[PDB]
Design a protein around this ligand. Sequence first.
Ligand code: SF4
Ligand SMILES: [Mg+2]
Ligand SMILES: [Mg+2]
Lengths: 308, 280, 168, 61
Amino acid sequence: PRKANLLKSLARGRVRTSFNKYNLFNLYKKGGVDLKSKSLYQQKWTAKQETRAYHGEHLTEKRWQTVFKPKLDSVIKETPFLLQTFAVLEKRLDFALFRAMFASSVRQARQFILHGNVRVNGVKIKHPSYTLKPGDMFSVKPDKVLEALGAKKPSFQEALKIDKTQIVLWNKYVKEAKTEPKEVWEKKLENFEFDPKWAKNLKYHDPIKLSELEGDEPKARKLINLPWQKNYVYGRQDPKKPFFTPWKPRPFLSPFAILPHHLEISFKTCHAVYLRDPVARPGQSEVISPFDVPVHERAYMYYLRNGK
Amino acid sequence: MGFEIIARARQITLRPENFPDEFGKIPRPWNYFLKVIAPCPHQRKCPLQVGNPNFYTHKEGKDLKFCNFQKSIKRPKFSIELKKGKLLATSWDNGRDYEILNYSYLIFERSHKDENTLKEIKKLRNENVNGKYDIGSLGDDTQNSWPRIINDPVKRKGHVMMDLCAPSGELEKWTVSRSFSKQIYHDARKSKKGDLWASAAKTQIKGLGDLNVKKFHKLEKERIKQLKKEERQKARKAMESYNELEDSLQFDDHQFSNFEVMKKLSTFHGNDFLQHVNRK
Amino acid sequence: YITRKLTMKPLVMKRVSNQTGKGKIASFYALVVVGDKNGMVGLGEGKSREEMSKAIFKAHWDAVRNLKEIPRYENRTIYGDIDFRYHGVKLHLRSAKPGFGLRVNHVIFEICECAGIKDLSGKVYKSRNDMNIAKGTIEAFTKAQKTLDEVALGRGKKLVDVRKVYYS
Amino acid sequence: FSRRRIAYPFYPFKKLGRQHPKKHDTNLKTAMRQFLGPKNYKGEYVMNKYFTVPTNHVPNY
RNA sequence: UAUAUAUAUAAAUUGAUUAAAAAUAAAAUC
RNA sequence: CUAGAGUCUAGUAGUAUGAAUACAAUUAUUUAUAAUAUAUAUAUAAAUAAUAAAUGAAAAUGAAAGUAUUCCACCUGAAGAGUACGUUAGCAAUAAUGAAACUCAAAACAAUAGACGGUUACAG
RNA sequence: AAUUAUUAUAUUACAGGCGUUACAUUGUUAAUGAUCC
RNA sequence: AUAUGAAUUAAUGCGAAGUUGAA
Ligand code: SF4
Ligand SMILES: [Mg+2]
Ligand SMILES: [Mg+2]
């Protein structure tokens, strides 16, 4: 397939099927597609660029042309008929994984499939192009779903330095509390909206040395006793798991958390069911896209004639 | 306009920029070679050349100067009989026996096709460059490269000042005095416009005044570099105007009046079309 | 109403000369279409000597003035086929199924987009001038189109009778 | 008229001014930084509204 | 059971002096 | 141009807004009949002129260049070319039929504004 | 004697120039500046 | 007859800056 390159470039500003921060900003700053002061060919080309950046970036153009279905399906508000231009892709396995929130990208879902982490009706499918029929149940290994929806596991060095800084700031807080305890308690209540033993209960912590703690993670595990992370380096409660182990949702997840209509998801088991092919209905389309109907109809007119 | 014509012809024929740091007169290519006989005393660029004639017509062009040349001719009978009447012999709203005629002119001399002239020109351009002729220099000190008196010499007690196109090629003020000598003062004191002056002077400074053509050469080059800022400014100028439009028209508070809003749309497309044809 | 709802799109923008004795005088012609996308459309023309902006300005006002209601079937297409001759352009336009695109000439595309004609398939024969295409397009849209209700009333029939029977 | 248009933010943002020649920065990166906010020592961007997920059954888009 | 950590210094490739960018592209990490 | 006749006859040869049918609003003139008592500013027809609608790229057409039907002939960018070759007739002259390669992005029509003409007059 | 002045005498910056507009900007209907002796 | 070559020979196409007539 297409070799990923400059997918998230800010100058180009093309939105991609990804949960990435750069993709989030590209979606944020775009506003809307500009089809004005343009000939029909230029409008069609812009619509192709915008829509084809999102729906099937990996698909080769001459392959997408063959996959493209000129005949669409539709089951007071207006039916958005031509948002179904890319509904054919929604039955591909990788797209189903991405829409089920079992991956942070269509490319990541592709790697999950190709690396044998995906099953469809209990048979391991290793081909991203496998098309889902209605009623199929597909599952992903829970470790990979947790990695996809979790923060990056810090290296040992990075988390060790983060712990260094946390000890520094915790010592600072307890120092300032000891100096001026009464108003510290009162002003903490001020945000939350006297017992002098309060500051007495708080206890210092010893600054660690990177040179001496390097390369000894079991030792560093015992040496940390912060109130919030007791006896584990930051983000590495069990260092043998693929994710930030005190499991934390990945950054910038709310913008891209859409619950698809055509899939029924079980996050507890990392399973999903393909209810139906996405279908447009009055005032609503089940093809999750960031572009308006004019862009989709321009892309549809492009692909009907193949750019003529 | 005529001065512009001669200047352009000289530029395209000699192509001064194609031979930088080459002073003096050696025939120039255009088995074909040509040189300037007169009036020009140098094959380098013309110091008086401003590209467009129309800018002689502007308020700022009210002191620009051109390489004209005057002469006097006595009227024959018919002109005397002809230039009489209200129509032709009055202020169109005393008589003379002669007319002062203005004209610009140019001359080229062509080299001889031969095994001699071609190698001669080639070797002259190779081995003996004539160095950087300084302001004040007399070139080769032969009639070919003498400074030409391009303005009427101004003469006062003891001293004659001359405005010259120099074989170095810069506008020059040369002052002769009774001091520097008696004979040189005598000759300069009979010097006139259109003559080649051929001696040394006590001061040979640049002809600073109305060298604004060099100031104009700056302005045009400013435009070319900053012309490309113009479209780029115009982009944000119109973008922010329309981004303001869409905000309050998508929000639809319509602080901007219906008359004025549709004026913006007129500017948006009008600016678009004008950019189209400018490519052509 | 006018600014917020109506959309303006330039259709023609050109320089036309009127060579006078002294020299070539060049003016700017602009032809625009204004439509609310909800069953009202109009065309406008403007001619300005000094800058095209004024041409488009007067064209926008003229289009606003000639804004007219346009018959529409299901608010998405023409009621039936329209075969229309206008000053040398032959427009053959066909209503289409829901979801069908605007598979027409570009000028007709902007006109339909402005006027809310979602569905159409057409061909332009004989001359293909954009000017004449647009004028004939609007004329054939409004003169050459009759509503099923109007046809039935003129024939004194109920809509159930006039409506076509389904065959397969 | 189509132009290769660098996808600058539609909203207004604080652009670059006079820059140290070795900064080698672009307006888009400044827009990125202003959209995110300061970067925490942990690598987070707490100041943003979108860094953290909602928790009251109301999606934050 | 705290948490918008803040300060300094040092550097900072190509182009450019800001809506002129190359460029999240590299490296690095999981 | 050819033969026979005493200049004539007999010739060879074949150049230099298609036809029909059905229908189609007025006005004004005439034109030819048919009446009724010069008057009915008489009706029915055809010819002429300006229209309406309609057609057309327009000029313009406007009972046809309109609405329809039927039959035939003809056209497929400019130039090469109505040329070459062959055939057909002709003593011959000529006529008919009639290409091809090469070259080009032209070429043409109606109308608009202009400057041009010994183009016209007319004025100031 | 030191200083300050004034007054001479030297002292050189210079003064001087009906030199420049192919030397400009003001001002007006000469001045400043730039340069030149 | 279908082809392939030909001294000798007919016409025409192009282009270079021009030359000559006044159709
Ligand atoms: S000013 Fe000098 S170079 Fe320029 S045209 Fe006159 S003589 Fe020639
Ligand atoms: Mg383009
Ligand atoms: Mg640099």
